[PDB]
Design a protein around this ligand. Structure first.
Ligand SMILES: *[C@@H]1O[C@H](CO)[C@@H](O[C@@H]2O[C@H](CO)[C@@H](O[C@@H]3O[C@H](CO)[C@@H](O)[C@H](O)[C@@H]3O)[C@H](O)[C@H]2NC(C)=O)[C@H](O)[C@H]1NC(C)=O
Ligand SMILES: *[C@@H]1O[C@H](CO)[C@@H](O[C@@H]2O[C@H](CO)[C@@H](O[C@@H]3O[C@H](CO)[C@@H](O)[C@H](O)[C@@H]3O)[C@H](O)[C@H]2NC(C)=O)[C@H](O)[C@H]1NC(C)=O
Ligand SMILES: *[C@@H]1O[C@H](CO)[C@@H](O[C@@H]2O[C@H](CO)[C@@H](O[C@@H]3O[C@H](CO)[C@@H](O)[C@H](O)[C@@H]3O)[C@H](O)[C@H]2NC(C)=O)[C@H](O)[C@H]1NC(C)=O
Ligand SMILES: *[C@@H]1O[C@H](CO)[C@@H](O[C@@H]2O[C@H](CO)[C@@H](O[C@@H]3O[C@H](CO)[C@@H](O)[C@H](O)[C@@H]3O)[C@H](O)[C@H]2NC(C)=O)[C@H](O)[C@H]1NC(C)=O
Ligand SMILES: *[C@@H]1O[C@H](CO)[C@@H](O[C@@H]2O[C@H](CO)[C@@H](O[C@@H]3O[C@H](CO)[C@@H](O)[C@H](O)[C@@H]3O)[C@H](O)[C@H]2NC(C)=O)[C@H](O)[C@H]1NC(C)=O
Ligand SMILES: *[C@@H]1O[C@H](CO)[C@@H](O[C@@H]2O[C@H](CO)[C@@H](O[C@@H]3O[C@H](CO)[C@@H](O)[C@H](O)[C@@H]3O)[C@H](O)[C@H]2NC(C)=O)[C@H](O)[C@H]1NC(C)=O
Ligand SMILES: *[C@@H]1O[C@H](CO)[C@@H](O[C@@H]2O[C@H](CO)[C@@H](O[C@@H]3O[C@H](CO)[C@@H](O)[C@H](O)[C@@H]3O)[C@H](O)[C@H]2NC(C)=O)[C@H](O)[C@H]1NC(C)=O
Lengths: 221, 221, 221, 221, 221, 221, 221, 221
């Protein structure tokens, strides 16, 4: 049995859905159930399949740290109860991440270009990084067959966390057209206002004085 | 009797309040009323004073263009009815503004510095502009009124519009802060995602010059 | 009844014309009148229509703060008298604005560029901003199709005023790169010398420095 | 049970050791065993504890892709056999990775700086990265409480990989006259490529400059 | 008897005064007279001394080319009549000048600098050149004592004219300031919109790039 | 009767010719005469016409300040004597001028270009300015109509003077021939040394950028 | 017996002195003599010593190529006659040289700076090169002891010749004076106009864009 | 009798030959002889003709300053002995020479370009300079009229010396955007010192550049 954490972007609307899927498919299955910590009857809903239980959760409970239980009641497995739990690590006071958007270091001869948004020192583990091309998400922009965004794992030093996000596209488009790309960070520290943090960049508006020199001495004979 | 349009900032959360103030204070007053276009009985609420009527409106009605009526029913003015209306032009497809964040142009001497945020070609006439000093609203932060900001009036052309916004503060902070400022543009062209357009100027570092170098001396032909 | 302030540009010749238009057109009309503060018979002139009253005012009176009165004497409205007044505030000493010419705002998405001329703190409200293409006003050469200019309203911080003005044209003309533009500002604090202040821009300015090289010296041990 | 891949740095001497650890510690344990794919008796050695099996492997087998098997023979678990294996993904050919040193990310809030090393593409999933400070990787009187380094996970696209690694230290050391930092990358393609980043001060005029180098000079004493 | 042309700056207000001074002072004098071409009685007035005749002339007459006559009627010289004439060449249509601001000319030996404003190929011979420091005339400043300016004669190449004008001051103001000096050119052709043309110059305008760096990277083998 | 000062270029050979022309041509003429200050008989010569008197003068007399009187002795005018004088102001002590050669300010659009020569602070007040295209007088080369040039009049500030000289030609030549233009200033402040001061602009090459590199990988610990 | 060619600088005044000195001092001496090619009596003068014979020569004869004879008539050597000759190579039309002034190549800290003047392809072998500092000869300047100058030998390729002249002084003086230097070449092809060619140089005025970088790789152990 | 100094290039192998030629050819000749300072019998060899004496010398003697004597023993001249000597002044410490490559001298009139090599300070007054293109001697497969090289004499200020050398060729080859020209200098105080110059073009934007470098890299294979 596997559970999926509620989507962050939606909980930034004070609502979301916590689904619990069942993996014990080797034997038969009977029904899913969503219960409370005390075992009280917690109202729930049914998903596409009977092995999937959906539960609507508001920001109040999610932030407060309340723990819910998803259980499987197969006729053959009723001898035991796999009463999984949704435990959220709480405590501490949120720390605001420090976002840095780094320009690409690829040279002209290179084939593709990558933009990296790096965020450091935020305590709450859950975060989300998205990208915009000019002012529309890359996942929905018309030009979406040549952009590839990804996010790495979280590296923890002390009580805080840090991650690196990425977005890659062809060098020709980087050096041909003129648009502004933005890395958008969703984090809990910014719930009071905006609910979001952003950093923008474009080729023509960086103007870093530069000098490039390459020396090859073949030493050939 | 004067009405005030709902605050866009909170209407982006799909809810808001339309308050109705009464100006005919020269004679006495009896009661306020909030009705529909057809004159039906439209549920309302009461503000601090009896001359103030509050009405809760969702984004559905506001965007659809439904018109409400606020009326005054003074015992002496009952001969007539000042049944004001809230008319909000609806028009057609919106347009996404193109924001530009223009940097200061003053010199080392001037006592003050000014950041300009020009936002152009947004068809709907409802727009809001805020500023963030480092990551939090400039209105509330460590700055004890050290930061001031004001927005100009709107320009028209075609069926579009345009506007500027300015943030002013002493240049001592400008050259001894090492922070990142940002102009936030609340508009309804991006109601499908984020609901905000940002442009930022980063001062956390100052590496104006860069140099790259490579040197291969293959010692084997 | 609506009044129009005397043109500043004309008043930079120590002459102008204060026109008085009548808005109470729902009933009939009889005659216009231009009087003094004391109600004395102040000589006036007549415009195209009987509802338009022209009054010639010299710089002496306008600067001194003298107040004139325009009245309507309709046969039916003679019971009352809507004796309008023209009052220009004059409490202070002028201040010289610091004009700045900000960075160009290009957008290849629509192939258009806009240049912003910003006027900083100046006490007296009366100001006027015009544009020159090379050495003649933009409204002479090709304004009919290529160039469009506009100016916003004033924003008052303390006792002083600021205003933004813009000029917009195609980016293809931007690439001509053989045209210096210039914004000229008229204001009352320059009456002693030339009545204007000028600033200029050119397509080529504030551009970074880049040097790229590759060398292959084939040595021969 | 759990196995640990052979060290890449050691394997750059054409030898290494593959250790096999046992995790089924809930019941007792009897002996470890290291066998071949066919089950033949493969000579092995014993480590500090009986639950640890060490096997010496040369570069020939490791590169060829030969698979070895580690088995546990507990007196109670003899009913079954957990004959784990060591499967290495081998295909195509090594791809020369390009490594970039990204711009530093200063943060005056806590007075720290971070340098990033980004290895773009490399087919085989095995890679190692180390940081040098004037040729002083770690424990060389500097890496005690001054410099910290970590490495992220692998992000895969198509049939290639990439990774980031970071080095963090206080900005006080970042303001020294000149210090040489390097990011050596040991990859199974015998790369051993060192990329240098330095902070230099212009001599004729004093201005901060950031220099990047890539000496490939194969000069050896 | 010598005549003085009307001031151009005043005539940019459509008014001026043509003075007639008498030089035949060796014998006595009786009275001055200002007449028309036909000898008709042309009204005039008198100045400080009886030998000075003032005549008010408007813009129309001056541009049209009308010629006035100044005569002396000494009791002894009445035998003849020295009927002076004011002839102003009219010719064809005007031309505009192309104003240029040439390079500065410094002298460390004498510790002084000089700025030149060159006007090129304007047809009408009447032109005036004035200087501004920041936005006010040089002749009226706290530093006006240490500012010297002058204009040369007119060199006629073909049908057009050219003349040079300069401004000289010490080298310390030049090095240690951020003032923008401007040369203003009044001329008849540029009369419809504004009466003047302007240019600007600043110490830090055209400079060369310079990069000077040194490096020492102790590798090891 | 009018006199012409001796040419400076020839007096830089310590010899010259002082010609005396006669203007009283309304009546007849008899003979010219060249005398001394004391009226003594000063030997002279005869020019093309009897009304022209030539007198050979060396540098000694010219510099010393000696005067000479040219007189007309017409049979009818013998009643009086128009005994003109050649008075050359002398005093002070020569001051060597400073020469500045100012490059053209024009751009690639206009079809004419101009070079400027600014000579300043020459006390004797006797200068001559010439131009050389390629070490050849502009007036004796293979393109005379293709080059035009005139100098302005002196402007005096204290006891010194200053002048401007201009050389004008088409913009096509300025981009093609790649020659070395120079401005030659004849003055008496340096008779002891070379009698001229030159300033040159060289256009025989165009290497706007120059890079210097040096490597050293000592192979000795 | 040794002869010295007449000075050129003075031959540019159409006069000079050809002196012949006697070296046969081992025996006694009687008298010097200056004769013609035909042996005719050529008038001469006597110098400081009886062994030195001076002969005044004009530029007409010197250019024509006439050969003179200087002879020694010692009482003991009268048996023979050492009738030396002054033969000038006059075999073609003069060719004007092309002079190039080269800026110093010293970078910094070199303690010395050199200025080179290279003359190219002049036919007549006789030429002189001199140097001027702020337009005053180096020999008779206040800072004469701070400057050194020298001229190399002549290298003949075909029918023409070429030379290199040099001027060396301290680097600090080069970087802390802001003066203008100039190399002046005296040659015969320029007798028509100014008798000389001249090139000028200045540190600040001549400053193309440049980049200077060095890289030591101390291979320490 | 004339002698020829030993070749420096050969002496860079610690051996050479000192040839002694005889000029007293007017009378007969008998035999040559090579002796020591003391007159002792110093072994020698015979060249093509009897009048030429060859003597093999190692670096030891040549550097030490030993002086040899060459004598002629003609049957008629035996009355005297013209015992020539080979004395090389060598009393001082060697100092490294500094080599500069001055700016090219382009003469488009003749379509030629000359490069200059300048050796600034070498104490031993024996030096050799060679030019090479593409790492090939100018006299190797490049000795045709395509290239021409020469060297000037030596100029000494005090204890040191300096020289100039030139290489001339048509500028058609100079327009080839990539060729390497080098100076190699042999001198006692060193062994070899190369200095290359190239004529490249900026890759991103066309802008010719002139590069100059001195790769001291041992690079010995
Ligand atoms: C580099 O990054 C890795 C990955 O974040 C760091 O290892 C991780 O360290 C954290 C703790 O800082 C581990 O989380 C938890 O640690 C506590 C320690 O008491 C433990 O009780 C929890 O059960 C949990 O393990 C995390 O699991 C661990 N991850 C891995 C893959 O090792 C590492 O410390 C970082 N090193 C440096 C020098 O920054
Ligand atoms: C410069 O900006 C000003 C302010 O936007 C422009 O004036 C405005 O021009 C628009 C053009 O459509 C006017 O729209 C009109 O609105 C009234 C509202 O009652 C409507 O009845 C008309 O049919 C029309 O839609 C707007 O009123 C007007 N506002 C003001 C204060 O004048 C001005 O036109 C701009 N300059 C240029 C050159 O366009
Ligand atoms: C931002 O700009 C706006 C527009 O200029 C400022 O609003 C203006 O503020 C001034 C100063 O308080 C107001 O002047 C007042 O005018 C009334 C008469 O209308 C007079 O009775 C008062 O004594 C005072 O002089 C002006 O009316 C007001 N205009 C508008 C349209 O609101 C605003 O204060 C600026 N600063 C901000 C918003 O922080
Ligand atoms: C962003 O980076 C992550 C790094 O994990 C990428 O996820 C990984 O993508 C690779 C390549 O598709 C997956 O490899 C696959 O592994 C399975 C066995 O686990 C194998 O059966 C497949 O044939 C293939 O080799 C890898 O599993 C997958 N890992 C995870 C945790 O998802 C992700 O695809 C990257 N996304 C973008 C947009 O670049
Ligand atoms: C700008 O340049 C003009 C032209 O040189 C200057 O005017 C000239 O100034 C000089 C020196 O004061 C005058 O010389 C003297 O004039 C008086 C009066 O005629 C005479 O008695 C003296 O013997 C001597 O010649 C010169 O005449 C005068 N010329 C003109 C046409 O005014 C002018 O002063 C310069 N501007 C400034 C601010 O100095
Ligand atoms: C490099 O420069 C040297 C400069 O000396 C050139 O050597 C000189 O070449 C000229 C060629 O005409 C020689 O002229 C000859 O002079 C003798 C009398 O000495 C005369 O009898 C001949 O008829 C002819 O005029 C000159 O003597 C000679 N000088 C020396 C010292 O060698 C050399 O040729 C130049 N080489 C190149 C490749 O440019
Ligand atoms: C310019 O360069 C020339 C050539 O190097 C310099 O001429 C040289 O000057 C030195 C003296 O400073 C002479 O050295 C002396 O030579 C005599 C024998 O001739 C010897 O007895 C002395 O003890 C001393 O060594 C050297 O001969 C001479 N070389 C030539 C070729 O003339 C000249 O000094 C430099 N400076 C100037 C201003 O010309």
């Amino acid at each position: 049995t596997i559970i999926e954490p509620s989507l962050e972007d939606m909980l930034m609307n004070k609502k979301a859905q916590l689904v619990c899927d069942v993996n014990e498919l080797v034997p038969g299955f009977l029904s899913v159930k969503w219960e409370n910590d005390n075992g009280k009857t917690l109202t729930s809903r049914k998903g596409v399949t009977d092995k999937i239980a959906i539960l609507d959760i508001t920001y109040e409970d999610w932030s407060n740290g309340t723990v819910f239980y998803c259980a499987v009641d197969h006729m053959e497995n009723l001898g035991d109860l796999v009463k999984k739990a949704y435990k959220r690590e709480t405590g501490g006071v949120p720390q605001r991440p420090s976002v840095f958007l780094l320009a690409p270091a690829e040279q002209t001869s290179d084939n593709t270009v990558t933009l990296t948004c790096y965020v450091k020192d935020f305590y709450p583990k859950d975060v989300l990084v998205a990208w915009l091309v000019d002012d529309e998400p890359v996942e929905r922009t018309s030009s979406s067959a040549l952009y590839q965004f990804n996010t790495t794992s979280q590296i923890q030093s002390g009580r805080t966390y840090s991650v690196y996000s990425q977005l890659t596209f062809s060098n020709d488009l980087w050096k041909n057209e003129e648009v502004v790309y933005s890395c958008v960070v969703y984090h809990e520290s910014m719930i009071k206002s905006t609910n979001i943090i952003m950093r923008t960049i474009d080729r023509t508006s960086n103007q870093p004085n530069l000098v490039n020199l390459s020396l090859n001495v073949p030493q050939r004979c």
